[PDB]
């Protein structure tokens, strides 16, 4: 599903680190990223993000848990569940938030946010882990309408991925891209 122009476009689009990443987690269910080319570029999109949040505030107001090996991402969410008391979630997060003292899920998605926001909690049992799910649109929703960061965080990230889209549009990869999503 996709085009080598779509890998091409990952490859020049994101942070080696990021490419190594995402490369590194699709061949752990064996798909090649040089075949499903939307499902790499989505999956570079969401390691982006995640980091962008990270970012977001204060200095070490945050955690990263996503893009961290299986073993260094449950040493860090048995530590934080240990140190604040906090419920261990039954899946891995993507962040922990020091601030909040919450667990943030991270959701981007081509289709629209109320159908992906409603998929997020499904899954999650959490019940206190927060959801915030951003579209390529500059659609956003949160749980509970609490959006973690301030504006200017979020105008932010709602731009690079506008920013990725358009640049996905120049190139015709666009249309695959938005369709592709399972
Ligand atoms: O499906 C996942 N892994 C298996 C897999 C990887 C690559 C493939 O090519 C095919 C399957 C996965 C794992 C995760 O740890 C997440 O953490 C995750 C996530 O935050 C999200 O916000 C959305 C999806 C997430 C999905
Ligand atoms: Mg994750
Ligand atoms: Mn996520």
Not at 54 to 67: A, N, P, Q, T
């Amino acid at each position: 599903s996709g085009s080598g122009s779509m890998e091409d476009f990952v490859r020049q689009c994101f942070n080696p680190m990021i490419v190594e990443l995402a490369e590194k987690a699709m061949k752990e269910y064996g798909e090649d990223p040089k075949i499903e080319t939307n499902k790499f570029a989505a999956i570079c999109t969401h390691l982006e993000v995640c980091f962008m949040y990270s970012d977001g505030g204060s200095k070490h107001r945050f955690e990263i848990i996503e893009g961290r090996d299986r073993i260094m991402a449950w040493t860090v969410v048995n530590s934080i569940c240990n140190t604040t008391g906090v419920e261990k979630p039954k899946f891995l997060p993507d962040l922990y938030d020091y601030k909040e003292n919450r667990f943030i899920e991270i959701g981007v998605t081509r289709r629209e946010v109320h159908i992906y926001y409603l998929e997020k909690a499904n899954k999650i049992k959490s019940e206190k882990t927060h959801i915030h799910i951003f579209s390529f649109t500059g659609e956003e929703m949160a749980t509970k309408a609490d959006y973690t960061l301030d504006e200017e965080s979020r105008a932010r990230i709602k731009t690079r991925l506008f920013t990725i889209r358009q640049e996905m549009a120049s190139r015709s990869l666009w249309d695959s891209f938005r369709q592709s999503e399972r």
